[PDB]
Amino acid sequence: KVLRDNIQGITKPAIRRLARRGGVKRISGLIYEETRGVLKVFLENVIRDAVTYTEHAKRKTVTAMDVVYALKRQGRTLYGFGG
Amino acid sequence: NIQGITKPAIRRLARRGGVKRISGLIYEETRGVLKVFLENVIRDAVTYTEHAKRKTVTAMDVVYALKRQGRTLYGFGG
Amino acid sequence: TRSSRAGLQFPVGRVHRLLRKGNYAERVGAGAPVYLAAVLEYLTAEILELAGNAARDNKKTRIIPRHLQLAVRNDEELNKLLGRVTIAQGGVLPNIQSVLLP
Amino acid sequence: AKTRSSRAGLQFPVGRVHRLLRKGNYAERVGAGAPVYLAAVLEYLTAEILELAGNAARDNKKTRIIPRHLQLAVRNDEELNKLLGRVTIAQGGVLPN
Amino acid sequence: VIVPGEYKSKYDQCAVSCSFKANEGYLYPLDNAFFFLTKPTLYIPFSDVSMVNISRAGQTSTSSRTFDLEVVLRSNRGSTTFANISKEEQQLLEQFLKSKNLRVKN
Amino acid sequence: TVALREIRRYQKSTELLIRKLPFQRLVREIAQDFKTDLRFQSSAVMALQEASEAYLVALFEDTNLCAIHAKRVTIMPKDIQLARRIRG
Amino acid sequence: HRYRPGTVALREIRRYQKSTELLIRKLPFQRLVREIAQDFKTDLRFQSSAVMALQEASEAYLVALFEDTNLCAIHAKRVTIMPKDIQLARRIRG
Amino acid sequence: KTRKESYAIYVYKVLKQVHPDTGISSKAMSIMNSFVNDVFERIAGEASRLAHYNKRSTITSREIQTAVRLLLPGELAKHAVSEGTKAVTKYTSAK
Amino acid sequence: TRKESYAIYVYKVLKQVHPDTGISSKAMSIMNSFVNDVFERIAGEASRLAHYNKRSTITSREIQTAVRLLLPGELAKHAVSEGTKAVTKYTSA
Amino acid sequence: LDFLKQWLTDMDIPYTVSTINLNWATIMKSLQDDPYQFFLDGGWNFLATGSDDEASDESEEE
C-alpha cells in the first residue's frame, strides 16, 4: 500500500549509538536528519541494482544473492549472506 | 631525486588545487606522498612487464596498472 | 550488410566477432551486437555533442582534451560515469573557495 | 594417487577448481598447470585467516571462531587488511580505539 | 471560532512539515495567522508580520526539501527561519503569499 | 562520563543497532518506487542492514576525525559533508 | 605597485586552473620515477609515453589531494594549509 | 605494419552526424577510443556476469539491456535502452 | 539439491591449522564467500592478463602474477612461494 | 605489558586484568559515601566476568 516516516524509523538513540560505535564523543543535534538522508541515498543505490538483477532474473523476489551482487557493484562487498 | 620536486613546483600544484597560502612543511610532506603513490603505481607496471616478457615499461601496461589501482587514465594508451 | 540492416554506425559484425573472441560466453546473441553497438554509438554521440558545445564556447573547431574534460566534469551525469577516470591533459575545472577571495 | 587433488596433495579440490575455470570462460582453454597453483593460493590464504581467527578466539577463550574474531583479525593484521579493506565482514563489529 | 482554511497543500494536504529546534512539525496557514505545531506551538499573525525572505542554494539536491523562508515579527523583534522546503511547497507558499498581498523581500 | 563508556560498550558488540522491522519497512518502501509486488528475502533485508550499519560507522569515524582537526570535540554537520566529499 | 599579500597567489590559482600544462618538470620527474623503479627491476627501461602517463596520473592525484587539503583547512577555519590537513585528507580517503 | 583496429572511423562518423563542422584531434580521438573500449568492456563484463549468474550461456540482448540499465546513471540508461530496443526491432524486420 | 561449497575442504584446513578449534555456520559462510571472492578476483586477473598478452590459455604463470598483483607484499611473497612449491610437487609426481 | 607487570610486582601492588567497563564517577561517589560498600558488594572481583551470555551454533558438516 503506502508507507511514510520509515526513514524517521531510524531513531535518534540509534544514530547516537552508531556514532558512539564509530567513536563520536559529543553529537550535535543536526547530525540525525542528514545521517538519515545519507542512509537513504545509499539504500536506493543498493536496492536499484538488486531489483535490476532480479528483473533480469525474471523473479519477483529480491534474493540475498542479488543484494550481495549489487553491493559488489557498489564496491562495498559483504561476506556472509548467500554466496 | 624526490627533492627535485621542489618548492615552486609544489606551490604551482597547490595553486592549481586552489590553495592561497601554503605552509613550509607542505613541500616535504607532499614530496613523501608523491613518493608513496609513485611506488604504488610503478610496482604494478613493472610486474605487468615481467609477465609480458618485455624489458621496457610500456604505456599500455601503465594504463592497465592505473586501472587496477582504480585511478584510471585515458589517452596515453589504447 | 547487418550494420545497415540495424541502421547503426558502429560496427555490428565487428562487435559480434569481438564478443565471441572475448570469451564472454559460449554463445553470443544475434541482437546482442546490434543492441550493444547502438548503446556505444549513443554514448559516443552524447560525449561528442557535449564536447563540441564546450569547444564552441572555447572558440575552437577541433576538440582537444581540455574540451572533453570540461564537458565530462561540468555535466553532472558524465562526472559520475567517468568519476574515477582522469583525462590526459584535461586539467581541473576553475573552482576557487570563497574564504580565499579578498 | 587416483584423484587430482591427491596427485597434487592439495586440500582444496584441484579437479573442481579446474572445472570452475573451464566453465567460467576465463579463457578459451585453461591449462592444466593453472588450477593446482590457484588451489594452492586459496589454501594459503584460508590457512592464514583461519590461524589468525583461531588465535583471536584463543584470546577470547572461546573455542569456536565467530565473525567477530574473523573481522578482528582482518582489521588488525595490516597486510590482510589491505587485501580485504573494501570488504565488510557481517556482524564483525569495530576494533577498540 | 476559527475554521481551517480551504487552501490545499502538496498532495491535497492541509499543512507542510519542517524541522525546528531539532524537531519536525507542521505549518498550517489560516485567515489571519500561521500556526506552527507542535513543540513549541507558535502563532505568527499576519498583521504583526513585518516581512519574509527566501534563501536558496544551487544544486541538484534543491528539489528535495531545501529552500528556506525567514519571517520577522517587529513587535517582538523576533526572527524565525523555516528550513526544509521543496520546489512545489515553496511555489504554493509563494502563491498564497501574493494572494494575501504580504511583503516578500528579495 | 557514561558518554565515554557508551563509545566503548557497543564497539565490542556484533549487534545490529538499527531495529529490524523499521528497516524492513524502509527497505520495502524504497523498493516500491522501482517495482511493486516485490517479495524480498529476509536474508536480503539483513544483508542490506549490515552494509548500512558499517557505512554509517565509518562515516562517523571520519566525522569525529574532522572535528578533532577543527579543535571541536562535537561533530557538526559540516563534518558530514566534508567526509562525504573527500570520500567522493 | 607593491601587491598586498595573497592577491598574486589568487591570480596564480586562476592562472593554473585555466592552464592545461604539466606543473612538474619532465626530466626531474623522470629521474625520480627511474629511481623508484630501480628497486623492483634494475636496469629497467621506460617507454616515454608511459613516463608521461605516470606523470599526469601523479599530477591528478596531487591536484585532487591539494583540493582536499584546502577543504580541510577551510573547515579548520584556517586559510593556510598545514600538514595536519594533508594527513586528515588522506585518512578520510582511506 | 600490423593491422591495429580502433573505433576512430565510427567515432568520426558520429561526430559528423551530430556536429558536422567540428573535427577531432588525434589525441582526443585516442581518448575517445579509450572511452568506447572501456564502456564496451564494462557493459560486456556486467552482461557476461549476469548470464553466468543466472546460468545462461547465451548473451542475448536482454543481458546487455540489464547491463546498460545497471552501469550507466539512469538518465542516459533510459535513452540507451530505447535506441537499442529500436535497433533490435529493425534488425528483426530486415534480413 | 547439490550446493557448491568450499566448506567441506575449509573445515579440513581449519583442523590442520588448529586441531581443537571449531567453526560456527556463520563463520563458515564467511569463509565460503571469501574463497569465492578471492577465486573470482585471481581468475579474472588471469583472464585479463591472458587477453592483454594475447595468450589464449591461462597458466600457472598468469596465476602467480595475478597473485603478485592482487595480494599485498608479504602475503604475495608467501603465497607465490607456497604456490610454486605446489605446482612443483604436482609436476614432480 | 611484561615490564609493567614486573615493575608492579617489584612495587608490591596487586594488579587486575579485565575487559569490562563501569563508571569511575559512580564508584567514586559511592565509595566516598561508604569506603566499604564495594568490598561488601564483592570488591574488585566484580570486574571479572562470570556469566555474560551464551553463544554457539547448530553444526557445520557436509
Numbering used by the authors:
A (entry chain b): 20 to 102
B (entry chain f): 25 to 102
C (entry chain c): 16 to 117
D (entry chain g): 14 to 110
E (entry chain O): 369 to 474
F (entry chain a): 45 to 132
G (entry chain e): 39 to 132
H (entry chain d): 28 to 122
Sentences from the paper on this structure:
To localize FACT during nucleosome transcription, we reconstituted a transcribing S. cerevisiae Pol II−Spt4/5−nucleosome−FACT complex by withholding Chd1 from the assembly. We employed single-particle cryo-EM to determine the structure of the complex at a nominal resolution of 3.1 Å, with densities for FACT at lower local resolutions. The high-resolution density observed around the Pol II active site allowed us to unambiguously define the nucleic acid sequence register and revealed that Pol II had stalled with the active site located at bp 17 of the nucleosome. In this structure, four turns of nucleosomal DNA (SHL −7 to SHL −3) are unwrapped from the histone octamer, and the proximal H2A−H2B dimer is exposed. FACT embraces nucleosomal DNA near the dyad position at SHL +0.5 and contacts the template-strand DNA backbone with the middle domain of subunit Spt16 at SHL −0.5. In our second structure, FACT additionally binds the exposed proximal H2A−H2B dimer using the C-terminal region of Spt16, as observed previously. Comparison with our first structure shows that the C-terminal region of Spt16 has replaced Spt5N for H2A−H2B binding. In our structure, FACT only binds the partially unwrapped nucleosome, and does not interact with Pol II or Spt4/5, consistent with recent results that showed recruitment of FACT to transcribed nucleosomes, rather than the transcribing complex, in vivo. Superposition of our two structures results in a clash between Chd1 and the FACT subunit Pob3. This indicates that binding of Chd1 and FACT to the nucleosome is mutually exclusive, at least in the highly defined states we trapped in our structures.
Efficient transcription of RNA polymerase II (Pol II) through nucleosomes requires the help of various factors. Here we show biochemically that Pol II transcription through a nucleosome is facilitated by the chromatin remodeler Chd1 and the histone chaperone FACT when the elongation factors Spt4/5 and TFIIS are present. We report cryo-EM structures of transcribing Saccharomyces cerevisiae Pol II−Spt4/5−nucleosome complexes with bound Chd1 or FACT. In the second structure, Pol II has generated a partially unraveled nucleosome that binds FACT, which excludes Chd1 and Spt5. These results suggest that Pol II progression through a nucleosome activates Chd1, enables FACT binding and eventually triggers transfer of FACT together with histones to upstream DNA.
